[PDB]
Design a binder for these strands. Structure first.
Length: 223
DNA sequence: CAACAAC
């Protein structure tokens, strides 16, 4: 019951600088967000200026908050739909009805992955079968249509980062060789599923590894 | 905390 502040088994009579693991092992989000191309940074900055001019500085902050909240709500609704036992009325949930009918055999939900040797961590949405094929599934709300996998920006990199980590994480006894990005729409129009077979996942894996090396090179130029 | 999105 008792927790001592001192440790009488020790004595009390270059300095140690022990790294904090959570600070030196990045999340997938952090790696991707800190290594965007100058062109993507430009497009996002030009869009943000247009939004601030249209909405005002506080209006844009509120827009940004609402985009995040809508996404979090969608994922909360999905977590309860995908688990064994007002949130479920949204247009996004309507958007993915035809996808959900092909999803089965859920094996992980909002579950931590850590790559033992590439030193990154993440939290995946979902591992489940889509039309019988076991997938890391990345569910995404989106304001604009994303009818091609190339319309999804870094989403395929997030998918393969989770696959590679999960496949080399001793907390998991199975491997996953396919990915799926599901883009859902607020007006209820049919969601776009972008399936990634093993070949396509291996192609994006190369690109993810480059982003991870860019992040690593960026952090040692900061030290 | 990560992921939650924006192009």
């Amino acid at each position: 019951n008792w927790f001592p502040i001192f440790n009488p088994e020790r004595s009390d009579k270059v300095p140690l600088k022990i790294p904090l693991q959570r600070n030196v092992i990045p999340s997938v989000t952090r790696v991707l967000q800190q290594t965007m191309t100058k062109q993507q940074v430009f497009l996002l900055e030009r869009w943000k200026q247009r939004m601030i001019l249209e909405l005002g500085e506080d209006g844009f902050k509120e827009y940004t908050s609402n985009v995040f909240l809508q996404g979090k709500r969608f994922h909360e609704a999905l977590e309860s739909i995908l688990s064994p036992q007002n949130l479920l009325k949204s247009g996004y949930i309507e958007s993915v009805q035809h996808i959900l009918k092909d999803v089965s055999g859920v094996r992980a939900l909002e579950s931590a992955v850590q790559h033992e040797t590439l030193n990154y961590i993440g939290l995946l949405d979902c591992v489940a079968e889509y039309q019988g094929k076991l997938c890391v599934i990345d569910w995404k709300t989106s304001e604009k249509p994303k009818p091609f996998i190339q319309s999804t920006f870094d989403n395929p990199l997030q998918v393969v980062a989770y696959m590679g980590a999960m496949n080399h994480d001793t907390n998991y006894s199975f491997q996953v060789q396919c990915g799926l990005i599901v883009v859902a729409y607020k007006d209820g129009s049919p969601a776009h599923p972008h399936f990634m077979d093993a070949e396509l996942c291996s192609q994006y894996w190369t690109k993810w590894l480059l982003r991870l090396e860019e992040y690593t090179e960026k952090k040692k130029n900061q030290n």
